[PDB]
Design a protein around this nucleic acid. Sequence first.
DNA 1: CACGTATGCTATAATGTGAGTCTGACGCGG
DNA 2: TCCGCGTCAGACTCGTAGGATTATAGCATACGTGAG
Lengths: 50, 277, 1341, 251
Amino acid sequence: IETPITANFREGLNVLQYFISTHGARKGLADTALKTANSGYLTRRLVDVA
Amino acid sequence: RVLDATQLYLGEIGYSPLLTAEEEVYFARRALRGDVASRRRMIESNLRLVVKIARRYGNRGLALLDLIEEGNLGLIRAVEKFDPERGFRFSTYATWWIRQTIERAIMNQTRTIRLPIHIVKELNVYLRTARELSHKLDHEPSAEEIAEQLDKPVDDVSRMLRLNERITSVDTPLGGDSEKALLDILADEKENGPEDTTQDDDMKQSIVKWLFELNAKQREVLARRFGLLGYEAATLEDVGREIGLTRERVRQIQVEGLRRLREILQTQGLNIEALFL
Amino acid sequence: VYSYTEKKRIRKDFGKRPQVLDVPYLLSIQLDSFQKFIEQDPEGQYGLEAAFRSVFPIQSYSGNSELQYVSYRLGEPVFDVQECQIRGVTYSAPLRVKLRLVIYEREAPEGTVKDIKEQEVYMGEIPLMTDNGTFVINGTERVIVSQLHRSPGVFFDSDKGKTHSSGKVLYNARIIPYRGSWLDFEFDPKDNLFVRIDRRRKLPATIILRALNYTTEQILDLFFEKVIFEIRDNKLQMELVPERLRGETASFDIEANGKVYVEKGRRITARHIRQLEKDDVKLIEVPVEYIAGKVVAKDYIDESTGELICAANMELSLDLLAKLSQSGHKRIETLFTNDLDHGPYISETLRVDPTNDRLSALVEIYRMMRPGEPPTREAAESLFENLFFSEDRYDLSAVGRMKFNRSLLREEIEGSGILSKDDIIDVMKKLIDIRNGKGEVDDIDHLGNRRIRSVGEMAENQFRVGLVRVERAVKERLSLGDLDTLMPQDMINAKPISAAVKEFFGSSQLSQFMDQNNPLSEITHKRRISALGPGGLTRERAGFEVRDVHPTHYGRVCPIETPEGPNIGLINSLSVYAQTNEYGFLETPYRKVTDGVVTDEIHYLSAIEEGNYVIAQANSNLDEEGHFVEDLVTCRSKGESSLFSRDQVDYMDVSTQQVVSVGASLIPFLEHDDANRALMGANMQRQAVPTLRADKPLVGTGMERAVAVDSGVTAVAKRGGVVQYVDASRIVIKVNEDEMYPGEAGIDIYNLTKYTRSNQNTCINQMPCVSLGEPVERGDVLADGPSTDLGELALGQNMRVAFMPWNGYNFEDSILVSERVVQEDRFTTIHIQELACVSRDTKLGPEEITADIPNVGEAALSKLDESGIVYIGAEVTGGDILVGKVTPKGETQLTPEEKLLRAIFGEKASDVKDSSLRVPNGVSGTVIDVQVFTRDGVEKDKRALEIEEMQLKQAKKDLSEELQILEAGLFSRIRAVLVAGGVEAEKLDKLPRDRWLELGLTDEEKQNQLEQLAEQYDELKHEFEKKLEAKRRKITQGDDLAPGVLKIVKVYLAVKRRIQPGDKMAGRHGNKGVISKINPIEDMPYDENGTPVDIVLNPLGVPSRMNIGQILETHLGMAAKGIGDKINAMLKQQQEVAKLREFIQRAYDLGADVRQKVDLSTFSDEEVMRLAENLRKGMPIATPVFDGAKEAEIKELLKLGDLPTSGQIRLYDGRTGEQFERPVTVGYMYMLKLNHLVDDKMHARSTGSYSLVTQQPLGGKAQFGGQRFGEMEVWALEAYGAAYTLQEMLTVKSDDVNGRTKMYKNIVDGNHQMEPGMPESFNVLLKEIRSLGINIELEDE
Amino acid sequence: VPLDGGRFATSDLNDLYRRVINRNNRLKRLLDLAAPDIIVRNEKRMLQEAVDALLDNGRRGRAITGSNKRPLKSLADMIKGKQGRFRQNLLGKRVDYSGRSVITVGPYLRLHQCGLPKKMALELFKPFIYGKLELRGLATTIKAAKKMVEREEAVVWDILDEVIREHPVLLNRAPTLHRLGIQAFEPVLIEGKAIQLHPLVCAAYNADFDGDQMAVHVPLTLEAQLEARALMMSTNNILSPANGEPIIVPS
DNA sequence: CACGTATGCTATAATGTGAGTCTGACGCGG
DNA sequence: TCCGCGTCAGACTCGTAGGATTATAGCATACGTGAG
Ligand SMILES: Nc1ccn([C@@H]2O[C@H](COP(=O)(O)OP(=O)(O)OP(=O)(O)O)[C@@H](O)[C@H]2O)c(=O)n1
Ligand SMILES: [Mg+2]
C-alpha cells in the first residue's frame, strides 16, 4: 500500500489507519489457514519420496 | 457428440414409423397369428407412447431410462393380449398395460428393504386420507385421526406409517463438511469390546478350576446338565442319559454342587458383591 | 435529561464527538425482511403475493380448465414458541389460500360461463420468525443467516492474461438474471466475438443477431460507422471526417483543394486535424490502391443484370471497384475500421459465422443446447424465445433491470424482466467499446456488485419452487379429469410446498443453530452475512481477493470481524449503522455538508453513490454550529483518502463507530489494539459464558446498554408507569393514564423466564431489576437477562490484575488466579443440559418405563418414584438412573456359564433387558424439571398424571389471577369515571363490586365510558373461559411422535461448575490464557494497603501481541475503582449528601473536552444516594471506539482517586513479605470465562467399542473414541526408531481383532507381550480391490 | 444395520448392486422374450452404465446421485481418495489407550516429567491395574477389579501409583511437523483435569497454553516402553533433527 | 384351509425428451 | 504445437441437526407354504 500508517498503537490508530491495517492483518490470517496446506502437501510429497 | 444413452435411444425411437387405425388392425391380426415383423413393428411404432407415460412418471423411484425400459415390458404384454376384433383403439388398451408394469416395478425396486404390494396398497389409502384431512384440518393428520376416518386399528395405521420411513445412507457424511460419515459414529454392536471378551475368558477358565475343586460326582452332574463341560445342555430329567439315570438324585446333587459353590463365592469375595451383576 | 434506570447508575463518557444519529435497532435486517415476505401487499410483489401472481393463473394444456389465485391468509400458530420448544415442533402458521377453478367450453370459443369453483385450500405451514429474529424448527432456536451474492444485471470482466502466454486481455460480458439462463459474450485471441448461452459451447456472436432477424447489412449498420467513397470522373475520392485519421500515419499524400496538408509517411498531429477541420474538408482525392482491403457495407448489385456484384461485409479489391464503377455506382459505403479506436470485430465474426439466415442461426443455437435432436422451425423458435424472451423462464427482477439500465447509461430504471433485442445489442456495443479503450470493467469485489439476500427473498424463492412443483401436478390433473365433479383441492398437494420450505428452514446451509452463549453472541449471529451455501461461493472456489477487505466495506461491513479459519473473509458481521437499500445493496449514513456548513440532514448512500462524493472523516473538527474549523479537511473519495478544501467537501461520516461492527464496538481501547488481536477479541467475547453474578464492565464503551436492550433477552417496559407487584417469576406494572388506552384494562404483565436451558446448555435466567413500587418510563429495563447488569451488557467479571511474572505459573499466557475468585463464586457457572429417554416399539415388543429394572441396587431405585422417573430437586451423579427403561428380549439363548449364573441367584427377572437413561459419566447436577410426552391411546403413567394435575391447577391459578387483577383494574377506572359527574365515594365502596352492572349516570360521554368498561369486563369473563378450555385441552392432548415411539421422558439437569486449572479465560483485546494454578490468598502479591491481587498476568504476552488496549483498560480500570473506593469510604462514614454531590460532580465533569455534561444538582437526594451506592463498587466509564479516553484524561482521573499517574504500585510478595524490586502495573481488567472448560474437553480411553467395517475404535468423546494416530504422527515414530510402538498403534491398538483381545489378556496377566496379527482394514482393502475385478493375492514365502 | 430409531441405514454399494441386478435380469427377460433390437440395445447401454457406476462413479461422465443429490459412493471411491482406505484407515488409525485434554504449565516438573490427571491415568492403565490387583489377591477376578475401580476405592489409587512408576507415556500435539512433536515422559499423577507440560519442551511442540490440547498414548509392550525411554524420551531428544542447535532451552 | 404373496387385467383417444454455472495449477495426448 | 482433459491441494479436536421427499388403483385369480 502506497500510504503507510504514520501512527503507532500507543498513539491510537485513527479510523482510516485502522481500516488500512485490516488488509495486511486478514491477509496474514488467511495465509495461515491456506498456505499451511501447500506447505503441508510439500511435507507429504517429500516424505513419500524419501 | 451425442454420447448420452437417453438421447441416443430417443433418437432411435423418433426414427420409427407411426401407425394408423387400419394399419394397427392389419398388423395386429398378423401379430396374434404369429408374425415376427408385425410384433416388432407394433412394438417399435408404439415406443413413443411408453416414453410419454414414462415422462410423467419420473421423480418417484427409478430414472427416466429405467421407467422407459419397464414401460416397454408393458407394451409387449399389450401387443401379446391386444384384441383387434374389438372396434376400440390400441392406444387406449396399451396405456393400461404400460402404467400397470411401471407402477408395479416402482413399488418393488424403489425401496431398498422390499415392501410387499399388499402393504403398499394399504399405505396408498392411508396417505390419500391424510391429504383430505390436511385440506380441512389446517394441521396435519394424526395416526389416530386417520384410523378414525378408515374405521381401522390405530396399531395397524402406526405399523404402516412406520414402513413409510425411508432409509438413511451410512456412507453419507453428516457433519455438513465431509468431517465424519455415519459409519464412523455407529459401532459394531455384535462385536464385544476386548474388556468384555476377556471377562468371559476369565469365567470360562475359572469354571475348569472350580469343577476340579468340589466333589468328583458333583461336577460330573452339574457341568454336563448346563452344557459347561458336556456337548449338549440337558435338563434334570435328561442327565439320566449319561450314567446318573435318576430324577430325584440328579436334582439333590445339582443343588448340592451349587450350595458348596455359593460358599466358594462368599469366601473369595463376591456373593453380594457380584449380585448387582 | 436522563431516564430512571440511568439515574440509578450513570456511565462516565470520555467521548467528545456529539452523536447526531443514535444506534438503530440492531436486529432490523431479519425482522424487516421476513416481515416483507409475510406482509400482505395488494400491489407491491413482495413474498407470497409476488409468488402467487408469478405462477398463477395456471391454465390447462387442453385450455378448457384454469386455476386462479384470489388471496391467502395465515392461520394463527397452533402452539406458542414455548410449547413448540418443549414438544420439539416447528413454530408455524397454516397457509390457507383461496383459489378459483374456472372452466371454459371447448364448443364455445372462450365461454367462461360453465363452472367456477372457489375454495380455501391448505398448502403447508410456514415457519414464523420470533420477535427476536429467530425460527423455532423442531423445538430448536435457529437463525437464517443473510446471504451475499452477485447482483443480477450486467458485468463486464476480463481474464487479465491467464489464457494464452501471448498474454492477451480477453474482455467478456456476462448478463446475469435473477432467474433464467446466463448470457455470455466473450472475445477470442483473434478478436472474434463469441456467445456462450448458459456457458455451453462457443458460438459466433453474430449468430444470435441472425436469430433475432438481423440481415448482414443491418448488423454492420449497427456496429460500424459508414465511410463514403465517391468515384468522380476517373480519380477516386472519399468523404473525410477531420479527426478519424487522428494518431494514424498517412499512407498517401493527402491534398485538400490543391494544397498538400499531410506529408506521405508522417504521423498526423493535432495541428493538421484542426487545420483540415477549419478548412471544412469534405472530399479528399485518394489512390485506388487504398481501397484494397476496405470492407463494403451494403449489398451492391448490377442494375443491368440484377445480380450481386459484391455481398455486404466483403473485402474490396481494385477489380471489384472497377466492376462497381462501370455498373453505374459512384458511391460506396465502406466500414470505418481503423484498428485502435474502431476495431473491425463484428466484421471478422461474420466471416467466422457459418450460418446465413435467421432459420440457419436458430437451428445452430438449438443444436448447441440440444445436440443430436433434429431441428424443427417451431422447435427452434420456441426454444430461443423460451430462453431469454419468456416471461415465465426469464426474470431480471427490478434490481436486475435497474443495474442493467444504469450499466448501459440509461435514464429509465424500471422495465421488462425479459431481454429486449435492443438490450443485447447495447451490451455487445459496450463490450466492444471496452475492447476499444473507451470504457472500464465493473469490479466483482465492489459492494456495488455484491447484494444482500436476508430471509424474506430466500423464503420467497423456496416457496416459488414449491408452487412450480405444484403447477405440473395441477396442470396435469386439469387436463385428464372430468372438469365438473372435480374440485380444486383434489388436484392440489400441500406436501411439495411444505417439503420445499421445510428443507430450507431445516436442511439449508444458511439455517443454523443460533449461537446463544451470551447476548452478544446471539445479536452478532443474527447480523451475519455469509457468501457461502446455495447460490454462493464454496471454500474451494473462494480465492484471496474476495476474502480481503474491500474499500467499499467502509461503513457497511466490519473489516475486523471474520472467522479465523477456512471461512476467513466469506463470513462477515454487518457494521453498526449499516442497512439494506430497497434493492438489497448495503448503505451507510452520512451527514450532508451544504455550502461548507455541516447539516444534521442524513443520507444513506449505496456503494455506487459513495464513490461519487467526497466524504470527510468523522474525526474532522467541526466549528461550533457551522463549518469545519480546519481549512484542509481529511476526506475520502474515489475509494482513496487525502486532504481537501472546505468547498470541495460534500459529506461526512455520521459516527466514528460506523466502520466497526457490534462485537468490535464493545472493545474499549480498540484504537491501541492490533487488528488481528482485536478480531480474536471480538470473536472470544461471543464465547463468554455468563457467570452466577452478572458484573458490569468498569471500562465500557457505551454500546453496552444498546446491545443488552436490542438483544431482547432483557424484559423492557413498553408502557411504563408504576410497578404494582414484583416477584422472582413475574413483574406487574400499572400503566400511566397518558399511554394507558381506555379500551382494555391498563395492567402490563411481564412473565420472567426462569433458569432455562440454552443451545450450548448454558443458563438463561431473568431477574427483576426494579423494586416494588418504582416509577418507570417506556423503554426502561424491567428485568435483566443472563449476561446483563442494570440494563448494560455484562459478559464477565472485572478483576484486580497485576502484570508481572510468577514462578512460571504464567509461562505462555498461563494465568495465575487468587483463591478469592473461586470463593466469591465469580466465574462460577451453571449448565443446563436436556436428556431424553425414548420408549420405542420393537419387533419383540414395546419397551417399559417401569421402576422394576432387572439387576439394580436399592440405592439406585431410591431416587426413582412409582413410575420410574427421578424426583424434582434430586441431586444426581454419573451412573445414577434418571428414567428406568427395559428392552424386552425374545428367547434369550444364554450359554452354560450364564444359565448356571441365572440358576444360582434365581434372578431370572423376566424376558427383559436394561436400557435405562442414566446420567452421563462424570457429569453431575440437580434435576430441575421433567417432561413426559405420551401417545394419545396408551395409559398415562402415575407420575405423568400428577404432572398434569400441577399444570392444570397452575393454569387455573394463572388465568384466575389474570381475570382478578384485570377486573380490579377495570372497576378502579369505573370508580373514577362515576366520581367525575356523580360524587358517591363511600356509598359506592360499601355495596359489592359484583353488583355494579346496574350502576350508571346521565347520558354523556362518561356514560359511554361506563359502557366500554362494562363490555370489556364481560368480554374478559368469556375470554377467561375459552382460554381455560384451550389450556385444559393442550394439557390433556396426547402428542403424535415419530413412528416406533410410544412415549418420551425429558430430564433437565442443572450443574454448577467451579473455575479450575485448564479452564480457558480471555480479555476483550484478544488476550487468551489457560489457568495454571489457584494460589492461596496469603501467597498473592498484595498492596501497601494489604489488598491482594485477583489475577497475575504475564507482561511478555503484551508487547509481542501488540494489544496495548488491555494495559490502558487496566490503568483506567484502576482509576475507575479508585473513585469507587472514595465513594465506598464516604458512604461508610455516611457524611453529607452535599459533600458526595460535590465530589461526584467534579468527577463526572473531569475530561478535557468531555461531550457528556452531568449537571448533577437536579438529582434528588434519594436518587443521589442510590447512585452512589452503585458507583461504590467502581465508577463505570465509557471509552467509545476511536473517540476514547486520552492518557492525560486517565492520569487526571487517577489523581482524583489518589492513585499513581504511572498506574504502577508498590507490591509485596505474599510468601516472603519482601517488596518487589520495581513498581508493578495493577488495575482492573474485565475478564471472560469462555465456553472451553477442561471439564468438557478432558477424555481418556483404554478399550471401547469398535467401528463397523474398519474395526478401528470410534472417534470423539461422545462415542468414547480413541485419538486418531495420523500419517503425521506415524512419521514421527518412523524418524525415531520406534518400530514396536508403531506396530502397536497399527495393530493391537486399532484393527487387529484377535491381537487386541490377546494382548489385553497378556497385560492383565502381566506379560507385556504383543503377539501381532493382520489389521482388518487390510483384509477389507483386498475385498474392495477384488470387487473391482482385480486379482490381488498374497504370495507365500 | 438398524439404527436405534427402528430405521435402517445401508451402504450406497447396495443401491449400485441393486441397479446392476435389476437391469441385468431385465436384459435376461428381454432376451427370453425376443424383444426388438432397439430395446435390447437400450438395456445393454443401461447395464454398462450401472456396472460403470458401481466400479467407478463419476468417471463415466455424470455420476449417479442418490437420495440427497450427493453421488453414490462407489467401490473405487472407497480406495481412492485421501479419505479412501489407504490414507484414512491404513497409513494412520484411531488408537486404544489414547486420551487427550487441555495443557497447562508444570514449572515444578523436571524435563523428563509431565502432570497426568488422576482420572485420565486411571482409565488409560486399566488392564495394568486389573493385573496387579489379581497378583496381590485384592481382586478375586476381573469383573470385581472393574467394580473396585468404578467405586474408585482408596487402595486402587495406591496400586495405580505403583503401576505408573517408571512407565513412560507419549505426548503428541497437532500438528506433528517433525519427530519432536511426539515425546515420551515419565508421568506424575495430579489432581485436576489438565495435562501439565514442561516449559522447555514447549518449543518442540510449538505448545502455548492458551487452550491447546494434547494426545496421550500408553506404550504397552516392554519393547515399546524401552523405545519410549531410550529413543523418544524428552531428555534424550535435546537437539533437533534438522540443525545441530538445541530445541530444549529456557524461555 | 387359511394366509401370504403374485401375477392379472382395465378397451374414448392419447404416440418426441429436457441443472447450475466461477479456483489455479500442472502434466500429458490428440 | 494448441487446447480439452484430468489429477492434484496440512494435522488433529470437539458441538451438531434432519429423517425430509414423493406419488402409486382396486380387485380376482394364481402360486405356495404353513398351521390344526
Ligand atoms: N489453524 C491453526 C491454528 C493453529 N495451529 C497451530 O497452533 C499454533 C498456535 O496457534 P495460536 O495459539 O493461535 O498462535 P500463537 O502464535 O501461539 O499466538 P497467540 O496464542 O498469542 O494468539 C500455531 O502456530 C500452529 O502451529 C494450526 O496448526 N492451525
Ligand atoms: Mg494455542
